[PDB]
């Protein structure tokens, strides 16, 4: 966002290539966002990966329980190739959670989405474990 994120949001909230809309524009309308740097894939100014200078990106790496945690560099906004500071974590979930907290909240990067980042990390870790060892429980009991 070489221009202010508020302006970027004012422009892109109406339409963008990452916006997914379904079931019309009535009460049935469902909206989501596809950009990889949106923790909750939600079409909102808070989580938008296009209208924020500081953005958190959490996904699964190719192999070996490697989780990619990337942060958008505040000064390299005009350099897409080097816009993301990446870190591939292969250690335990505890260490991954500590690293995510340190890189998201302890430095006042984006404290408002610390919970979202932790939840996304937990979901990615669970997905990787299930992809490795197959489904073993239905997760239907409350």
């Amino acid at each position: 966002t070489t221009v202010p994120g508020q302006l970027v949001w004012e422009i892109v909230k109406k339409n963008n290539s990452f916006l997914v809309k379904e079931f019309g524009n009535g009460t049935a309308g469902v909206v989501f966002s596809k950009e990889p740097n949106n923790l909750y894939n939600l079409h909102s100014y808070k989580h938008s990966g296009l209208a924020n200078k500081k953005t958190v990106t959490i996904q699964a790496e190719g192999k070996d329980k490697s989780v990619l945690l990337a942060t958008s560099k505040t000064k390299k906004q005009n350099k897409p190739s080097t816009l993301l500071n990446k870190s591939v974590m292969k250690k335990e979930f505890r260490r991954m959670s500590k690293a995510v907290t340190n890189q998201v909240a302890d430095n006042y990067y984006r404290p408002d989405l610390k919970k979202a980042a932790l939840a996304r990390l937990s979901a990615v870790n669970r997905s990787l474990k299930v992809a490795k060892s197959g489904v073993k429980k239905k997760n239907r009991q409350a």
């Binding site: 979930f93 505890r94 979202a116 932790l118 939840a119 990390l121 937990s122 669970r126």
Partner: protein, 208 residues
């Protein structure tokens, strides 16, 4: 330590005495006198620090809603005045519907402990809900019956074969009950016979 209530309740939530009389009885004047014309100040109780809960293994994607506090606490189930120890009860439901049994005591859960006696009508020591029972005016002495060791836990399922210990306990309990029953003539037949409604019998008119 005061051994009697200072303010008896005329009704629920209203005391018999006013604030001035309560002051006089509680003796706040005495405490002020002894402390030097000023009430003693007591420091607030120190809260216990929360335990060092280990970090969670998972982080939910949604914030579960915590229910609001409910200030109402259930009270013990009330026992109808028509039901007293030794009262004869009529069962209106279940496999023993219509049977006449003897009431022994009310358990902690609120259910009623009853006995046939087992020999007279085949009804053992059992729990019956008060809502499915009719209390009659017939009373039998039960002072000689000891059921102290029997409580709500006696009937708890351990989860087909009845232990001999329960049979022995039933016999021991029923010996005194039958001995007391024998005093009243025809009470044996009354307890051995079930209750039924015949032609032109109106429950709303029967007194019981």
């Amino acid at each position: 330590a005061k051994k009697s209530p200072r303010n008896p309740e005329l009704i629920r939530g209203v005391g018999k005495l006013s604030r001035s009389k309560m002051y006089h009885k509680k003796g706040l004047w005495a405490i002020k006198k002894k402390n030097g014309g000023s009430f003693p100040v007591h420091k607030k109780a120190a809260a216990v620090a929360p335990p060092a809960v280990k970090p969670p293994k998972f982080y939910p994607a949604d914030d579960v809603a915590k229910p609001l506090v409910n200030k109402h606490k259930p009270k013990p189930t009330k026992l109808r005045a028509s039901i007293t120890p030794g009262t004869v009860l009529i069962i209106l439901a279940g496999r023993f519907k219509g049977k006449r049994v003897v009431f022994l005591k009310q358990l902690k859960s609120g259910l009623l402990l009853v006995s046939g006696p087992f020999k007279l009508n085949g009804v053992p020591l059992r729990r019956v809900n008060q809502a499915y029972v009719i209390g009659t005016s017939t009373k039998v002495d039960i002072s000689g019956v000891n059921v102290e060791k029997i409580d709500d836990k006696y009937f708890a399922k351990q989860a087909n074969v009845l232990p001999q210990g329960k049979k022995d306990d039933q016999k021991a309990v029923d010996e005194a009950l039958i001995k007391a029953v024998e005093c009243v003539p025809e009470l044996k037949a009354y307890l051995s016979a079930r209750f039924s409604l015949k032609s032109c019998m109106k429950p709303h008119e029967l007194v019981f």
